[PDB]
Protein: Beta-lactamase
Amino acid sequence: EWQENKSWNAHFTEHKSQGVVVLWNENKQQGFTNNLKRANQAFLPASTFKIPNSLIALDLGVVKDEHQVFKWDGQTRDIATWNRDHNLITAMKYSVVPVYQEFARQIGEARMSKMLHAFDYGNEDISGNVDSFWLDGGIRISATEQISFLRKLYHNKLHVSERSQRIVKQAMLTEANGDYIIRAKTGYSTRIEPKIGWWVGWVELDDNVWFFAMNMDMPTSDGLGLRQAITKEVLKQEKIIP
Ligand SMILES: [Cl-]
Structure:
């Protein structure tokens, strides 16, 4: 069952933007969103694709573990935190595109396509360049499709080893305190209109888990902090977090 709550539109409207938040209560098996249509509109996954990419790289042995170091290639890029060595944890934290481009090239078209079908991930279409299709290729995923994928991950039900899923969920760790844990991944899609920001993941509570997936219009990078801030207002409004 699903329920539309357009009162959340205020959180986007008060920040002069537009988007969708989708929540899923795992205990009650109920979904909630401000916009049923946009919740099912498919966009480029951009850096949210680092979740499945990590899973596949780990399960194929492209990545040995979360400690394996991927040395900087010496090419100075505009993101200072990309110009350094990374492991899976930091590559996810700083959303280091060049590291994941190399994963995909070593994964290869054939195995990447097969794995995304096995994950039932979005439209399962890797059309484009193998090292950038999630940035400007044909792959698409909706907010509700992110939920389904993330729920499988939470329950270790994806068609990779338990270890690979446990490692990726560790790398997704974003925030933890006495009240909740957030494991999540941001996304920023600019190469194809409309330009959007993503935030997908879940909130772990003592006795429940709330999966979430949001995207929002992102004409400039100035409003990137709104991906998390808007999501948290909805969570606070719904008394999921203090
Ligand atoms: Cl952990």
The radius of gyration is 17 Å. The first strand starts at residue 2 and ends at 4.
